[PDB]
DNA sequence: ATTATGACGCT
DNA sequence: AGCGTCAT
């Protein structure tokens with residue numbers, strides 16, 4: 001009753017750039033704008049692997065993880081942009097720099113948590129309180145929410161999508177109690193006003209469009225962001241959760257799309273998020289552990305407490321390359337040359353990071369995969385990172401991995417290596 | 431032969 | 442510390 005916490009204490013948004021790498025390439029090359037187009041890495045094997053797809057191309061069935069030659073079967077007029085190659089490998093610097101552009105704009109409105117190259121969570125609780133004091137009990141006009149959907153509305157007592165969006169928004173606004181400065185629904189609405197402004201600023205100042213979700217926590221904001229893409233934002237209220245979750249497959253919730261979500265489905269014999277409400281917190285803890293169990297018990301009621309961490313910068317800086325099938329590295333000279341190429345890219349990125357961000361990495365993590373292992377990493381070893389020098393880092397990485405070489409011969413490497421990965425970690429202020 | 435990342439939990 | 446999971 002009155003003591004049952006409802007998880008309505010915060011306003012959290014999730015902003016995700018639409019088809020990011022595609023948008024970066026479309027800004028640079030106007031010939032690609034408003035076209036079916038995709039971004040690929042490499043080219044010789046099956047035309048390269050697609051990693052980003054414009055919404056026009058998605059209409060033809062083009063998806064990430066598809067080979068470009070196969071995508072061209074679905075969409076013969078598909079336009080392609082290739083990721084830059086440097087030192088023999090894909091180099092994603094252009095997209096990391098575009099990411100910094102967007103995150104610096106977002107940081108003007110609120111503290112952000114960088115969740116990925118193109119997505120960030122935003123804690124808007126304080127900004128909403130501020131705007132509410134400025135509003136002085138003034139109602140919120142639909143004109144302030146020109147790209148907002150209200151999930152679950154319209155309901156009750158009409159043909160085109162924009163008209164639907166507007167009917168739902170009018171139903172939502174008409175039910176608002178703009179008197180109460182602590183009304184959670186009002187707080188979410190003001191949060192959506194602020195996110196409209198932030199998304200407008202991103203587009204004005206970068207050219208990039210994004211989608212967003214506004215709710216009371218990170219998981220609901222992420223789910224909301226996905227409901228109306230591209231170039232739109234969605235408000236998921238606490239009250240919308242029972243209906244939304246009643247037909248939501250468990251795998252759609254962040255963190256349940258893998259083995260744990262499959263175990264929830266199989267152990268409990270359920271399909272949808274809402275079905276979780278019928279179990280006690282102790283029941284869920286018994287099957288999934290104390291942490292997961294408490295998290296599921298709260299999450300299926302729309303409640304989640306994970307804070308938006310004040311972290312705009314990545315925690316690690318890493319360089320990785322796969323050597324699939326017959327390109328695997330089978331000589332010591334090969335392994336050394338590629339460790340050196342990865343280390344030269346890492347040194348470049350680390351030196352720029354130190355100049356921009358006043359910090360230095362202190363640990364080097366070396367990961368490899370050997371032929372025949374189905375795991376991502378076959379072996380992971382750390383060593384000290386005391387100087388931003390590529391020949392030093394590559395020699396140190398070789399020293400920490402050289403014992404994996406089964407070959408009695410000094411020149412050969414067996415079993416050959418199908419992946420190398422260098423990662424700088426454990427940053428300290430400098 | 432999906433690839434290049436990045437976060438975080440477990441023990 | 443090193444390994445596994447989740448994402449994408």
Ligand SMILES: Nc1nc2c(ncn2[C@H]2C[C@H](O)[C@@H](COP(=O)(O)NP(=O)(O)OP(=O)(O)O)O2)c(=O)[nH]1
Pocket residue numbers: 016017018019020021022051052053064117118229230433434449
């Ligand atoms: N190197 C690499 N980059 C990737 C990979 N997957 C994605 N990216 C890059 C390319 C993506 O542009 C970017 C952001 O990933 P999303 O937010 O998951 N996809 P997007 O923004 O394209 O579409 P949406 O409108 O649905 O949000 O990360 C990958 O496997 N490898």
Ligand SMILES: [Mg+2]
Pocket residue numbers: 016017018019020118
């Ligand atoms: Mg995106």
Ligand SMILES: [Mg+2]
Pocket residue numbers: 016017116118119
């Ligand atoms: Mg994203």
